[PDB]
Design an enzyme around this catalytic site. Structure first.
Site, PDB file in Angstrom:
ATOM      1  N   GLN A   1      28.652 -13.240  51.186  1.00 55.48           N
ATOM      2  CA  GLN A   1      28.672 -11.917  51.786  1.00 55.48           C
ATOM      3  C   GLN A   1      28.835 -10.840  50.715  1.00 55.48           C
ATOM      4  O   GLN A   1      29.210 -11.112  49.572  1.00 55.48           O
ATOM      5  CB  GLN A   1      29.797 -11.815  52.816  1.00 55.48           C
ATOM      6  N   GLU A   2      28.547  -9.598  51.110  1.00 57.37           N
ATOM      7  CA  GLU A   2      28.551  -8.450  50.202  1.00 57.37           C
ATOM      8  C   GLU A   2      27.632  -8.692  49.004  1.00 57.37           C
ATOM      9  O   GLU A   2      27.999  -8.462  47.850  1.00 57.37           O
ATOM     10  CB  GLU A   2      29.971  -8.102  49.746  1.00 57.37           C
ATOM     11  N   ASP A   3      26.419  -9.166  49.299  1.00 53.15           N
ATOM     12  CA  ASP A   3      25.382  -9.394  48.290  1.00 53.15           C
ATOM     13  C   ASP A   3      25.858 -10.347  47.194  1.00 53.15           C
ATOM     14  O   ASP A   3      25.597 -10.137  46.007  1.00 53.15           O
ATOM     15  CB  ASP A   3      24.901  -8.071  47.688  1.00 53.15           C
ATOM     16  N   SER A   4      26.563 -11.402  47.590  1.00 53.00           N
ATOM     17  CA  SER A   4      27.016 -12.409  46.644  1.00 53.00           C
ATOM     18  C   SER A   4      25.971 -13.514  46.498  1.00 53.00           C
ATOM     19  O   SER A   4      24.983 -13.577  47.234  1.00 53.00           O
ATOM     20  CB  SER A   4      28.360 -12.991  47.083  1.00 53.00           C
TER      21      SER A   4
ATOM     22  N   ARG B   1      18.915  -3.051  50.911  1.00 47.57           N
ATOM     23  CA  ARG B   1      18.307  -2.706  49.631  1.00 47.57           C
ATOM     24  C   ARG B   1      16.822  -2.395  49.754  1.00 47.57           C
ATOM     25  O   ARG B   1      16.282  -1.689  48.896  1.00 47.57           O
ATOM     26  CB  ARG B   1      18.528  -3.838  48.628  1.00 47.57           C
TER      27      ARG B   1
END
Ligand SMILES: [Mg+2]
Ligand SMILES: [Zn+2]
Ligand SMILES: [Zn+2]
Ligand SMILES: [Zn+2]
Lengths: 424, 41, 94, 42, 398, 62, 62, 38, 61, 97, 283
Positions: E164-167, E309
């Site tokens: 999550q959170e662009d991990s 994005r």
RNA sequence: AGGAGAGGUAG
């Protein structure tokens, strides 16, 4: 007299810069085998207003005993459950739990058997509801559980919730009805998390943690992915051609609406009156002059962009008609976890309106083609020669989308429009 | 004729011309030319 | 102790088995074997912390057999099935 | 023992002022690697 | 009429159609083309007067109206931007990030003669790989140093909420076989006009440690008689010792330390389309959602990053790479070019992937590695090209 | 940079197939046919043997 | 390009149609020098002073 | 640079303290909301 | 380095840089193009309205 | 209205111009849009109310939700000395004086 | 409430390839067997090296890493003890049960480039010799001079850690789907629609019979569970034309070995290890 | 040991 850090100690975590008082959160130290890194729950990212892309959290270890005593009594996470800005809850479900809950409550057609339900019951703190589905087929044994009862194991038996807007009724800790909207799940005035916090305020954190774990397990069982079919937004090639034609006609209609709206000035009071005017064809045949007149005036530009948005809302509304229910982008847009409908429209159908903030010395040719860039009289070539102008307010419409491929002039227009956001 | 060359032939010629340009001038030649002109004249 | 026994006070005929240094490859087969028994009502496993190599198995049975008895019976049945599969593979390879 | 640059010759100079290669002229020297056992974990 | 012959003017070569028929007369140097008039240099002021065609296909449709033509539309961009596949299919901000920051921060070919350079913080990747897709600018430059990184199988799916959170969630087994493993060489310089000496553990009689000594915190790396000791976060193995002096007589000593940087949890990785993230969790190979043929994904990314994005074409790049790599059950006439302004159509990519024996949408049916059950929704998989940035975890520990 | 052994994805031994691949490319063979002649049914091994660059030659020369 | 102050420059921070084929308009550093530093295009050449005399050749043309 | 108001900010207004750590953060859904991994 | 032989190219440079830098004190220095106004064109400005002729070598503006 | 000359107030000149049409303009609700000089025309309380309304409008335009008591406290803190002081050092110095 | 009765039928068997079908079993058993044979079967590999002379263009750690990945014969992997359990020695050089010493020495005295493959790697034990496929796995390339001499040892390890002790390679299993055709809605379809439906499948799973002018099922094991033919049938207007469902009690295994151990031996070792793990877990 | 010039990361 010094001892090393161990489990149970409290530290003050802060993320620079501190934009609000909720950035300071006291958390208990939990030792992990990982090294040179600190682990944080993804839900707690909202108070910190940060993401996992390189953000560094610097903590403060209190040495005095009184400092530790006051740290977990005033700056602890459970003490800051109520947001002091708007009075709502500080912690939400997150970007993943929201989508998982939306998929659980919206489908209503996927039944979970006994094994999967018992496996998922390990994370939920409450007991198992009755199956409610004894026989779904004449030759189907092993009675199954519905999807909405799985989400019902996250509420206390005494908790009652009612949301008239989404037709959500929770009686005796069981979810009875739900139609659409996904507004009660997100942060708002009447969200279920706020009602849970106002009900007990003693076990809300554990409920949220268990819900996150169970939803993550359920979504891993299901699986969420984004493929080229989601960006195509069409069942076959004929549907794609029909959508392209519809988008082109909608853009043409929006341009016509903007041209009509440009006439609401004091100069055309003689033409707008109910009388006999022989210059009706002149206002229609002059198609290339309207863009030049719009790019020179600011009030005209504001009217044009307002009319374009009003006429382009209907164009954006076509995604729900040409989009399937299994589309990941549509699911994430309806759930509200990430993105909106306009982003999907720009992804698949068309970018739409592109205008810059500050004035520039050039203007868009309203066509964005190969022949438009070579026209000596185009506004992009300094001036159109209609007295010589010096400044312009750019105004361009891009018919293509990111999936199809941006024209080099369209890419230049997009870069000019988006250059403002990159400034310091 | 005008169209006697063909479409693929012109694409190949464009690629070959780009390769020849990159082989002659190279990625950096403006600085070298400016420095050489400052030495000679 | 590799396997720990902890009875549940809230629910009768319920127990929790904590197995250390174990992965999903054992918990999944144990859970699937427990579902074949008619006396077993609730059978499942979970891995709460990936860093902490532990497996927690919760077994709920009727008023006819203890959870430990069902666990041992499932283990014995799985061992017999593995032995039968080994014999079948040895017969087929020759 | 020190190895020179473009010239192949063992310097083997330990004096503070001896920094120039013998019969070479250049003043660039590389330290030679001796026969020592080093253990690595694969 | 205005004529300029001064210096400092910017110009580009353009094809002229007036002498384009002279080319065909039944490898040509650029000087020959300039002398024969097939190509000419056009300034910024001169370009406004002439009519220029964008593509060859558009030139043959309506002749006698375009005075000039362009060799390729992708050459308008910079060297660090023209090599990016599907550049116009991405948002402007992401392309800007990729062409400005991630290109510079990538780790690839350092040098082929490391002995002559004593530069500080020299990093080199063990197994650099060129991308599967081809770019016309890269083909014309004939240099493999433009792309720095390795390509791994990337699946767009959620993995227990650890991305999550662009991990980013990577495969532990793939990293341990040599993927994304790079070395770091740091040099230390000391100037002496006192002399080099030991003056009373790993130092030799000349005042420098032997090659192969493991240096740690609190050890003297250069002995002067003062000595220079390593700091708290300085460590490595001695690679070479270089002694040199200038004409003035001042002696210089250079010691280089090398160490292997395996991908840690805090390391940050970047894509070719602006996707940025850090390593969230290291998952074992047996727990990944393997496909029908047993190919586990090396890298797993969160699907929520794409809508925010707004980076299309990375999926197109993955589909193109999968179509190129997968065999055909006639390999000629295969679409491989990824020119930013000459991208192939989506239908062509789908047909190419369908001829390879896979689904036309790039998604394949996968099975859960933990339970063995088949997932209800297909997961998109494709070998995208990723890069490793210079920002590490231990470099930020304070 | 020599061929990366063990083919990180799926763990296939491809350490001794670079010379054969170069020999096949020396003849009138395309990349796909050359990779198919090496008995590679998965695209991971084909990617590993297709994306590799020979860098050790320049190291030995320079 | 050198400017007096870093907070405000003017319209130089935005792309211009004169950048077509000369400098890269899609790539530029982000921050204080946003748009001031421009990367040159692939087919970009800088003219040099010509030693030959053009005045003598102009009268021959007419 | 350390003069005037900057001197005040760097001396009396803003100070540095001991027993502080700064590291990069990652995600871990298994950990509780009120617990921090060290 | 320029116009060097094949044997001289093997020992020395790594053939990865075309050599656009300078060696001042062991550190590479690179010039950056400076955008300057054209001095051979008539320049007309506003506020106030004026036209100026630039100077080539001597200040004859 | 133009502000070329600061000798006379704009509202004073506006009242004299509307003499023939005094009945048409509802003077019970008419008020200047400015905040600083509105206190000299209709009192500090009217300026405080208009400031609160403008602050609520700005918060709504920002998209965030802020409770009423915060804005009321800000308004009462910035108008404690009978005048709306600026956020600069001079305003704070005058407020303390 | 008792054990199951698996049935195993072998279709193809070789030294490093084995394809057999497992029936009357749940998916959990197949998944556990795959996990055990891909991550729990121990083999022997080089983990510790000791070099003396290294003047090659490559670094020492690079050579150690590419040496540690070389496959070795592991016929004694089940009988050998772990290094941490070997209490007879602390671990240094050759050992009777835990460590096997390897010696390598290469010196180039010719103008041609010398390729150091895996063939010139000698060990004291003839049973732990490296697997030879060919020219062998190349380690380094040497110019004139540039001697390389090293001493390495091999230890028994599990494939779970470092991913170099795993003998399995792409162990897969499918549910062996069964194809059901109503055979009555096909008669309503035209001749052109049948070819369109045939070409819609990504793989060759459906066939066309010219003598009967109807579709047939040929090689149903290559369906790959790609819902393309069903989607095409839905698009054409036939919802219940072709119904394909996975079979829960039937599986087809595909085991490919890396050369360390035989595929059948790998399966037997995986079964034995799973039985041992179950016995250890037994209370 | 202390200061000035550049580049870079996060919101
Ligand atoms: Mg961030
Ligand atoms: Zn010498
Ligand atoms: Zn492979
Ligand atoms: Zn031993």
């Amino acid at each position: 007299i010094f001892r090393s850090l161990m489990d149970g100690d409290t530290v003050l975590m802060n993320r620079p810069p501190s934009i609000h008082q909720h950035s300071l959160i006291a958390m208990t130290v939990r030792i992990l085998p990982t090294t040179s890194v600190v682990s944080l729950n993804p839900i707690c990212c909202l108070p910190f207003r940060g993401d996992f892309d390189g953000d560094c959290l610097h903590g403060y270890v209190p040495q005095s005993i009184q400092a530790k005593v006051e740290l977990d009594e005033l700056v602890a996470l459970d003490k800051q459950l109520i947001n002091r800005q708007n009075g709502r809850n500080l912690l939400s479900l997150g970007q993943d739990s929201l989508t998982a809950a939306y998929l659980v409550n919206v489908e209503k057609n996927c039944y979970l058997n006994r094994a999967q339900m018992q496996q998922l019951q390990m994370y939920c703190p409450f007991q198992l509801p009755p199956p409610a589905i004894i026989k779904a087929s004449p030759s189907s044994t092993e009675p199954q559980w519905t999807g909405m009862q799985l989400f019902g194991m996250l509420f206390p038996p005494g908790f009652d919730y009612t949301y008239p807007l989404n037709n959500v009724v929770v009686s005796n800790g069981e979810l009875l009805s739900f139609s659409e909207g996904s507004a009660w799940l997100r942060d708002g005035e009447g969200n279920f998390i706020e009602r849970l916090l106002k009900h007990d305020k003693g076990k809300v954190l554990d409920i949220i943690y268990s819900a996150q774990e169970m939803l993550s397990q359920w979504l891993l069982m299901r699986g969420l992915s984004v493929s080229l079919a989601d960006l195509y937004l069409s069942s076959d090639l004929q549907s794609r051609k029909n959508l392209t034609e519809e988008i082109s006609y909608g853009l043409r209609e929006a341009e016509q609406v903007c041209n009509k709206q440009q006439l609401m000035v004091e100069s055309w009071r003689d033409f707008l009156a109910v009388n006999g005017e022989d210059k009706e064809e002149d206002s229609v045949s002059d198609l290339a002059r309207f863009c030049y007149e719009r790019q020179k005036s600011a009030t005209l530009s504001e009217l044009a962009v307002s009319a374009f948005k009003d006429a382009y809302r209907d164009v954006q509304a076509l995604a729900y008609r040409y989009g399937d229910q299994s589309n990941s982008f549509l699911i994430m847009s309806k759930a509200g976890s990430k993105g909106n409908i306009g982003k999907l429209v720009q992804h698949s159908m068309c970018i739409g309106l592109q205008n810059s903030a500050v004035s520039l010395s050039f203007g868009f040719p309203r066509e964005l083609t190969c022949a438009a860039w070579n026209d000596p009289n185009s506004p992009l070539r300094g001036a159109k020669g209609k007295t010589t102008t010096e400044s312009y307010v750019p105004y361009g419409v891009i018919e293509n989308s990111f999936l199809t491929g941006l024209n080099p002039l369209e890419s230049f227009v997009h870069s000019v429009t988006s250059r403002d956001s990159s400034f310091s | 004729n005008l169209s006697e060359l063909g479409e693929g032939f012109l694409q190949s010629f464009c690629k070959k011309a780009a390769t020849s340009f990159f082989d002659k001038y190279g990625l950096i030649s403006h600085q070298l030319n400016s420095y050489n002109y400052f030495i000679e004249h | 102790k590799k396997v720990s026994y902890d009875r549940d006070t809230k629910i009768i005929n319920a127990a929790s088995f904590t197995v250390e240094r174990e992965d999903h490859t054992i918990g999944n087969i144990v859970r699937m074997q427990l579902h074949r028994d008619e006396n077993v009502l609730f059978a499942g496993y979970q891995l709460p912390h990936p860093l902490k190599y532990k497996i927690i198995v919760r077994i709920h049975t009727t008023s006819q057999s203890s959870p430990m008895q069902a666990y041992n019976q499932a283990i014995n049945d799985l061992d017999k099935e593995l032995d039968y599969l080994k014999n079948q593979f040895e017969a087929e390879v020759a | 023992t020190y190895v020179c640059g473009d010239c192949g010759q063992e310097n083997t100079l330990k004096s503070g002022d001896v920094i120039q290669c013998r019969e070479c002229g250049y003043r660039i020297l590389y330290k030679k690697r001796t026969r020592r056992v080093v253990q690595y974990e694969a | 009429v205005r004529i300029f012959t001064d210096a400092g003017r910017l110009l580009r070569p353009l094809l002229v159609v007036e002498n384009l028929q002279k080319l065909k007369q039944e490898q040509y140097p650029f000087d020959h083309l300039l002398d024969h008039g097939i190509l000419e240099l056009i300034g910024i002021e001169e370009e406004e007067d002439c009519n220029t065609a964008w593509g060859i296909k558009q030139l043959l449709k309506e002749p006698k109206i375009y005075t000039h033509c362009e060799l390729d539309l992708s050459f308008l961009l910079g060297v660090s931007c023209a090599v990016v596949p599907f550049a116009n299919h991405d948002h402007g901000r992401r392309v800007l990030y990729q062409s400005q920051k991630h290109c510079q921060q990538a780790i690839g070919f350092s040098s082929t003669n490391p002995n002559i350079r004593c530069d500080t913080l020299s990093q080199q990747l063990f197994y650099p790989q060129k991308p599967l897709f081809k770019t016309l600018a890269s083909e014309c430059l004939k240099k493999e140093v433009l792309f720095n990184g390795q390509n791994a199988i990337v699946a767009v799916n959620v993995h227990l909420g650890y991305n999550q959170e662009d991990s980013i969630v990577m495969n532990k087994a793939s990293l341990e076989r040599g993927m994304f493993r790079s070395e770091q060489i740091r040099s230390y310089k000391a100037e002496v006009d006192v002399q080099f000496g030991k003056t009373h553990d790993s130092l030799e009689d000349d005042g420098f440690p032997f090659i192969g000594a493991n240096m740690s915190t609190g050890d003297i790396v250069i002995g002067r008689c003062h000595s220079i000791k390593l700091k708290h976060t300085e460590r490595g193995i001695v690679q070479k010792v270089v002694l040199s002096s200038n004409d003035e007589g001042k002696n210089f000593a250079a010691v280089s330390l090398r160490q292997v940087r395996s991908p840690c949890l805090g390391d940050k990785f970047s894509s070719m389309h602006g996707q940025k993230g850090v390593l969230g969790y290291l998952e074992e190979q047996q727990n990944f959602p393997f496909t029908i043929q047993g190919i586990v994904p090396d890298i797993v990314i969160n699907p929520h990053a794409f809508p925010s994005r707004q980076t299309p074409g990375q999926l197109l790049e993955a589909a193109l790479s999968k179509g190129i790599a997968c065999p055909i059950q006639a390999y000629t006439k295969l679409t491989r070019h990824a020119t930013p302004f000459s991208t192939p159509g989506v239908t062509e990519i789908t047909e190419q992937l369908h001829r390879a024996g896979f689904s036309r949408w790039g998604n394949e049916r996968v099975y859960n590695g933990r339970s063995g059950e088949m997932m209800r929704s297909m997961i998109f998989m494709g070998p995208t090209f990723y890069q490793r940035l210079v920002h590490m975890s231990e470099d930020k520990v304070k | 940079m020599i061929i990366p052994v063990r083919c990180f994805t799926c763990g296939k031994v491809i350490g001794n197939k670079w010379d054969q691949y170069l020999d096949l490319l020396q003849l009138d063979y395309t990349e796909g046919d050359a990779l198919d002649a090496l008995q590679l049914v998965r695209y991971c091994c084909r990617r590993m043997l297709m994306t590799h660059v020979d860098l050790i030659e320049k190291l030995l020369n320079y | 390009q050198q400017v007096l102050y870093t907070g405000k420059v003017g319209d130089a921070r935005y792309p211009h149609p004169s950048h077509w084929g000369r400098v890269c308009f899609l790539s530029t550093p982000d921050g204080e020098n946003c748009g001031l530093v421009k990367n040159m295009s692939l087919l970009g050449l800088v003219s040099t002073q010509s030693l030959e005399s053009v005045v003598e050749k102009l009268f021959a043309c007419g | 640079k350390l003069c005037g108001l900057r001197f005040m900010k760097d001396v009396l207004l803003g100070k540095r303290s001991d027993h502080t750590f700064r590291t990069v953060v990652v995600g871990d859904p298994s950990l509780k909301l009120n617990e921090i991994g060290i | 380095t320029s116009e060097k032989g094949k044997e001289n190219c093997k020992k020395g440079d790594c053939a990865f840089d075309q050599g656009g830098y300078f060696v001042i004190k062991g550190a590479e220095k690179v010039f950056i193009a400076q955008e300057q106004m054209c001095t051979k064109r008539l320049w007309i400005s506003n506020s106030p309205w004026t036209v100026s002729f630039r100077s080539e070598n001597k200040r004859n503006r | 209205m133009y502000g070329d000359r600061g000798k006379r107030n704009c509202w004073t000149a506006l009242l004299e111009t509307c003499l023939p049409i005094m009945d048409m303009i509802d003077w019970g609700r008419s008020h200047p849009d400015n905040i600083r000089q509105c206190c000299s025309v209709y009192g500090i309380d009217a300026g405080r109310s208009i400031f609160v309304a403008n602050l609520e409008s700005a918060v709504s335009d920002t998209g965030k939700e802020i409770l009423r008591e915060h804005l009321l406290l800000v308004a009462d803190s910035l108008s404690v000395t009978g005048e709306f002081v600026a956020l600069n050092a001079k305003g704070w110095s005058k407020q303390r004086q | 409430t008792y054990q199951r009765f698996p049935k195993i039928k072998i279709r193809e068997l070789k030294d490093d390839y084995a394809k057999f079908e497992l029936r009357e079993t749940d998916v959990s058993m197949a998944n556990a067997l795959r996990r055990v044979m891909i991550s729990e079967v121990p083999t022997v590999a080089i983990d510790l090296v000791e070099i003396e002379v290294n003047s090659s263009v490559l670094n020492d750690e690079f050579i150690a890493h590419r040496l540690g990945l070389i496959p070795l014969t592991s016929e004694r992997a089940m009988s050998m003890r772990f290094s941490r359990d070997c209490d007879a020695c602390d671990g240094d050089g050759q050992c009777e049960f835990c460590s096997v010493e390897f010696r390598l020495s290469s010196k180039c005295v010719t103008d041609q480039t010398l390729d150091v493959t895996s063939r010139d790697l000698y060990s004291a034990d003839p049973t732990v010799t490296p697997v030879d496929f060919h020219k062998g796995i190349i380690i380094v390339k040497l110019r004139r001079g540039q001697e390389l001499k090293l001493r390495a040892i091999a230890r028994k390890g599990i494939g779970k850690d470092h991913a170099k002790w795993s003998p399995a390679a792409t162990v897969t299993f499918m549910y062996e789907p069964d194809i059901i055709i109503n055979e009555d809605m096909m008669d309503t379809l035209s001749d052109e629609e049948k070819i369109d439906l045939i070409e819609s499948s990504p793989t060759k799973v459906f066939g066309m019979d010219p003598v009967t002018r109807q579709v047939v099922v040929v090689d149903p094991e290559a369906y790959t569970y790609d819902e393309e033919v069903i989607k095409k049938a839905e698009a054409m207007g036939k919802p219940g034309l072709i119904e394909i469902s996975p079979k829960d009690d039937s599986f087809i295994f595909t085991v490919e070995s890396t050369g360390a151990v035989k595929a059948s031996q790998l399966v037997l070792n995986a079964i034995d290890l799973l039985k041992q793990k179950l016995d250890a877990v037994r209370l």
